[PDB]
Amino acid sequence: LPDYVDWRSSGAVVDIKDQGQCGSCWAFSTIAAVEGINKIATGDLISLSEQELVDCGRTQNTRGCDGGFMTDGFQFIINNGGINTEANYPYTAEEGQCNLDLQQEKYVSIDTYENVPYNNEWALQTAVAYQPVSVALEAAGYNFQHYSSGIFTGPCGTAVDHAVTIVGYGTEGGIDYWIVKNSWGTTWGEEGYMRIQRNVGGVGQCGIAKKASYPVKYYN
């Protein structure tokens, strides 16, 4: 595998977004991953709609601003035959009625999705070398919340409570890291991103390797 991966450097990452006062990180994670594979497969970077998932992708498990799961995110887009753009179906940071007109408007599609084998950073690195990957981690602690620079090494629990997107990895000063795109806007972390420790084993740093998944497009 490559020593350094950064999907931003090849235009596969949309500018940092902000979920605001809404537990919709799951939708931002879904979208950033879908945005990335679309660029990789088609050559075009298009910003896509979180609100569509919040309004239209509710399940027994996935509940708009009350949290949810990226797998339901990917599933909705598969079942719907695609997703509308950010500009056409804009983010409001609150639960709205599903706009069926805008739901019929499809600019990006996916064929399938896959789960990364759990607790396997090597398999996670393998998937990240190919595309951005949706992950959940333990982001509730003081240190994670106040992170502004460097490689985050904890402390953090391992309970997945917040979804983000891995957009790369590297090493600096002998410390391996994942590059994480968060949805707390640009004033958090390293302009909205975090470098977080990689190759610690087990569930990964803050449980990052516990529930990794990514969308699939058959043709490049």
mmCIF file of all heavy atoms in Angstrom, residues 36-58:
data_model
loop_
_atom_site.group_PDB
_atom_site.id
_atom_site.type_symbol
_atom_site.label_atom_id
_atom_site.label_comp_id
_atom_site.label_asym_id
_atom_site.label_seq_id
_atom_site.Cartn_x
_atom_site.Cartn_y
_atom_site.Cartn_z
ATOM 1 N N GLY A 36 -16.762 11.115 -2.489
ATOM 2 C CA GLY A 36 -15.410 10.658 -2.790
ATOM 3 C C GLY A 36 -15.374 9.586 -3.859
ATOM 4 O O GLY A 36 -14.583 9.674 -4.796
ATOM 5 N N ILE A 37 -16.230 8.572 -3.733
ATOM 6 C CA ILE A 37 -16.254 7.493 -4.727
ATOM 7 C C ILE A 37 -16.757 7.994 -6.096
ATOM 8 O O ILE A 37 -16.282 7.530 -7.133
ATOM 9 C CB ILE A 37 -17.037 6.236 -4.236
ATOM 10 C CG1 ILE A 37 -16.726 5.008 -5.103
ATOM 11 C CG2 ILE A 37 -18.555 6.499 -4.159
ATOM 12 C CD1 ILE A 37 -15.262 4.520 -5.050
ATOM 13 N N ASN A 38 -17.705 8.935 -6.084
ATOM 14 C CA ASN A 38 -18.166 9.567 -7.318
ATOM 15 C C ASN A 38 -17.026 10.241 -8.060
ATOM 16 O O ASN A 38 -16.860 10.017 -9.260
ATOM 17 C CB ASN A 38 -19.326 10.547 -7.089
ATOM 18 C CG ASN A 38 -19.981 10.980 -8.399
ATOM 19 O OD1 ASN A 38 -20.568 10.161 -9.114
ATOM 20 N ND2 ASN A 38 -19.878 12.265 -8.719
ATOM 21 N N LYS A 39 -16.224 11.034 -7.356
ATOM 22 C CA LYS A 39 -15.052 11.640 -7.982
ATOM 23 C C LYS A 39 -14.076 10.597 -8.534
ATOM 24 O O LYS A 39 -13.625 10.709 -9.678
ATOM 25 C CB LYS A 39 -14.332 12.598 -7.028
ATOM 26 C CG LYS A 39 -12.973 13.076 -7.537
ATOM 27 C CD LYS A 39 -13.130 14.014 -8.727
ATOM 28 C CE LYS A 39 -11.793 14.513 -9.251
ATOM 29 N NZ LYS A 39 -12.010 15.602 -10.255
ATOM 30 N N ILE A 40 -13.752 9.598 -7.714
ATOM 31 C CA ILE A 40 -12.853 8.516 -8.102
ATOM 32 C C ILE A 40 -13.347 7.768 -9.353
ATOM 33 O O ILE A 40 -12.575 7.532 -10.283
ATOM 34 C CB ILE A 40 -12.596 7.552 -6.915
ATOM 35 C CG1 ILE A 40 -11.662 8.223 -5.896
ATOM 36 C CG2 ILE A 40 -12.008 6.210 -7.397
ATOM 37 C CD1 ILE A 40 -11.828 7.726 -4.480
ATOM 38 N N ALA A 41 -14.634 7.437 -9.384
ATOM 39 C CA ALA A 41 -15.216 6.686 -10.496
ATOM 40 C C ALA A 41 -15.572 7.512 -11.740
ATOM 41 O O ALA A 41 -15.523 6.989 -12.855
ATOM 42 C CB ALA A 41 -16.432 5.896 -10.020
ATOM 43 N N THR A 42 -15.934 8.783 -11.562
ATOM 44 C CA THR A 42 -16.480 9.587 -12.672
ATOM 45 C C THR A 42 -15.612 10.778 -13.086
ATOM 46 O O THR A 42 -15.751 11.282 -14.199
ATOM 47 C CB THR A 42 -17.922 10.109 -12.397
ATOM 48 O OG1 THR A 42 -17.880 11.224 -11.488
ATOM 49 C CG2 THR A 42 -18.838 9.003 -11.843
ATOM 50 N N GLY A 43 -14.735 11.234 -12.192
ATOM 51 C CA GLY A 43 -13.871 12.381 -12.469
ATOM 52 C C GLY A 43 -14.476 13.700 -12.016
ATOM 53 O O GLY A 43 -13.816 14.733 -12.063
ATOM 54 N N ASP A 44 -15.733 13.670 -11.577
ATOM 55 C CA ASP A 44 -16.410 14.885 -11.141
ATOM 56 C C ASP A 44 -16.636 14.910 -9.622
ATOM 57 O O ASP A 44 -17.114 13.930 -9.028
ATOM 58 C CB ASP A 44 -17.749 15.056 -11.881
ATOM 59 C CG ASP A 44 -18.042 16.516 -12.242
ATOM 60 O OD1 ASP A 44 -17.152 17.175 -12.843
ATOM 61 O OD2 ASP A 44 -19.165 17.004 -11.954
ATOM 62 N N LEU A 45 -16.289 16.039 -9.009
ATOM 63 C CA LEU A 45 -16.610 16.292 -7.608
ATOM 64 C C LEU A 45 -17.905 17.088 -7.490
ATOM 65 O O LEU A 45 -17.986 18.222 -7.949
ATOM 66 C CB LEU A 45 -15.455 17.008 -6.885
ATOM 67 C CG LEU A 45 -15.577 17.160 -5.354
ATOM 68 C CD1 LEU A 45 -15.606 15.807 -4.641
ATOM 69 C CD2 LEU A 45 -14.464 18.035 -4.788
ATOM 70 N N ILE A 46 -18.911 16.476 -6.872
ATOM 71 C CA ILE A 46 -20.210 17.108 -6.626
ATOM 72 C C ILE A 46 -20.550 17.019 -5.129
ATOM 73 O O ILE A 46 -20.475 15.936 -4.528
ATOM 74 C CB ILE A 46 -21.350 16.429 -7.456
ATOM 75 C CG1 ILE A 46 -21.003 16.395 -8.956
ATOM 76 C CG2 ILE A 46 -22.677 17.133 -7.230
ATOM 77 C CD1 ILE A 46 -22.011 15.586 -9.837
ATOM 78 N N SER A 47 -20.906 18.157 -4.534
ATOM 79 C CA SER A 47 -21.375 18.193 -3.153
ATOM 80 C C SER A 47 -22.822 17.722 -3.078
ATOM 81 O O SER A 47 -23.691 18.226 -3.800
ATOM 82 C CB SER A 47 -21.231 19.592 -2.553
ATOM 83 O OG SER A 47 -21.671 19.615 -1.208
ATOM 84 N N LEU A 48 -23.076 16.769 -2.187
ATOM 85 C CA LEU A 48 -24.352 16.082 -2.129
ATOM 86 C C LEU A 48 -25.126 16.342 -0.836
ATOM 87 O O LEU A 48 -24.594 16.909 0.115
ATOM 88 C CB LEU A 48 -24.146 14.581 -2.358
ATOM 89 C CG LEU A 48 -23.385 14.212 -3.637
ATOM 90 C CD1 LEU A 48 -22.989 12.751 -3.606
ATOM 91 C CD2 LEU A 48 -24.225 14.533 -4.883
ATOM 92 N N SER A 49 -26.380 15.900 -0.815
ATOM 93 C CA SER A 49 -27.364 16.355 0.169
ATOM 94 C C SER A 49 -27.464 15.512 1.444
ATOM 95 O O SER A 49 -27.946 14.380 1.411
ATOM 96 C CB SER A 49 -28.743 16.475 -0.492
ATOM 97 O OG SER A 49 -29.743 16.759 0.473
ATOM 98 N N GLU A 50 -27.021 16.088 2.567
ATOM 99 C CA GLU A 50 -27.218 15.476 3.892
ATOM 100 C C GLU A 50 -28.689 15.501 4.298
ATOM 101 O O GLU A 50 -29.210 14.510 4.820
ATOM 102 C CB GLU A 50 -26.370 16.174 4.971
ATOM 103 C CG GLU A 50 -24.866 15.953 4.849
ATOM 104 C CD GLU A 50 -24.235 16.812 3.768
ATOM 105 O OE1 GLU A 50 -24.891 17.773 3.330
ATOM 106 O OE2 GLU A 50 -23.089 16.530 3.353
ATOM 107 N N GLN A 51 -29.344 16.643 4.062
ATOM 108 C CA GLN A 51 -30.757 16.835 4.422
ATOM 109 C C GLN A 51 -31.667 15.758 3.835
ATOM 110 O O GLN A 51 -32.587 15.285 4.508
ATOM 111 C CB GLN A 51 -31.257 18.228 3.998
ATOM 112 C CG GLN A 51 -32.526 18.672 4.742
ATOM 113 C CD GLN A 51 -32.299 18.808 6.234
ATOM 114 O OE1 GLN A 51 -31.366 19.479 6.666
ATOM 115 N NE2 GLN A 51 -33.153 18.167 7.030
ATOM 116 N N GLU A 52 -31.398 15.363 2.589
ATOM 117 C CA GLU A 52 -32.141 14.285 1.956
ATOM 118 C C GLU A 52 -32.137 13.016 2.809
ATOM 119 O O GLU A 52 -33.181 12.392 2.995
ATOM 120 C CB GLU A 52 -31.608 14.001 0.555
ATOM 121 C CG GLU A 52 -32.552 13.136 -0.266
ATOM 122 C CD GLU A 52 -32.149 13.025 -1.711
ATOM 123 O OE1 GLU A 52 -31.352 13.861 -2.187
ATOM 124 O OE2 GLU A 52 -32.631 12.090 -2.373
ATOM 125 N N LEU A 53 -30.974 12.653 3.343
ATOM 126 C CA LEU A 53 -30.863 11.469 4.202
ATOM 127 C C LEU A 53 -31.604 11.648 5.533
ATOM 128 O O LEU A 53 -32.268 10.722 6.016
ATOM 129 C CB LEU A 53 -29.391 11.126 4.459
ATOM 130 C CG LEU A 53 -28.481 10.848 3.257
ATOM 131 C CD1 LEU A 53 -27.090 10.484 3.746
ATOM 132 C CD2 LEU A 53 -29.039 9.729 2.359
ATOM 133 N N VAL A 54 -31.474 12.842 6.115
ATOM 134 C CA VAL A 54 -32.131 13.192 7.371
ATOM 135 C C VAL A 54 -33.649 13.081 7.209
ATOM 136 O O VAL A 54 -34.308 12.393 7.988
ATOM 137 C CB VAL A 54 -31.685 14.608 7.871
ATOM 138 C CG1 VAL A 54 -32.502 15.074 9.091
ATOM 139 C CG2 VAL A 54 -30.208 14.603 8.199
ATOM 140 N N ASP A 55 -34.183 13.715 6.169
ATOM 141 C CA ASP A 55 -35.625 13.720 5.902
ATOM 142 C C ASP A 55 -36.157 12.398 5.335
ATOM 143 O O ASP A 55 -37.215 11.915 5.757
ATOM 144 C CB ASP A 55 -35.988 14.848 4.927
ATOM 145 C CG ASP A 55 -35.713 16.237 5.482
ATOM 146 O OD1 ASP A 55 -35.361 16.364 6.684
ATOM 147 O OD2 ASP A 55 -35.866 17.206 4.697
ATOM 148 N N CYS A 56 -35.434 11.827 4.372
ATOM 149 C CA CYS A 56 -35.975 10.741 3.547
ATOM 150 C C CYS A 56 -35.423 9.340 3.844
ATOM 151 O O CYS A 56 -35.980 8.342 3.372
ATOM 152 C CB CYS A 56 -35.782 11.070 2.063
ATOM 153 S SG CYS A 56 -36.520 12.628 1.516
ATOM 154 N N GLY A 57 -34.343 9.264 4.620
ATOM 155 C CA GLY A 57 -33.706 7.983 4.928
ATOM 156 C C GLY A 57 -33.881 7.491 6.356
ATOM 157 O O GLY A 57 -32.990 6.834 6.893
ATOM 158 N N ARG A 58 -35.022 7.804 6.973
ATOM 159 C CA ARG A 58 -35.333 7.345 8.327
ATOM 160 C C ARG A 58 -35.604 5.845 8.348
ATOM 161 O O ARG A 58 -36.334 5.332 7.496
ATOM 162 C CB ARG A 58 -36.548 8.089 8.911
ATOM 163 C CG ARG A 58 -36.264 9.510 9.383
ATOM 164 C CD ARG A 58 -37.442 10.078 10.178
ATOM 165 N NE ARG A 58 -37.433 9.649 11.582
ATOM 166 C CZ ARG A 58 -36.911 10.350 12.589
ATOM 167 N NH1 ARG A 58 -36.341 11.537 12.377
ATOM 168 N NH2 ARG A 58 -36.963 9.863 13.821
#
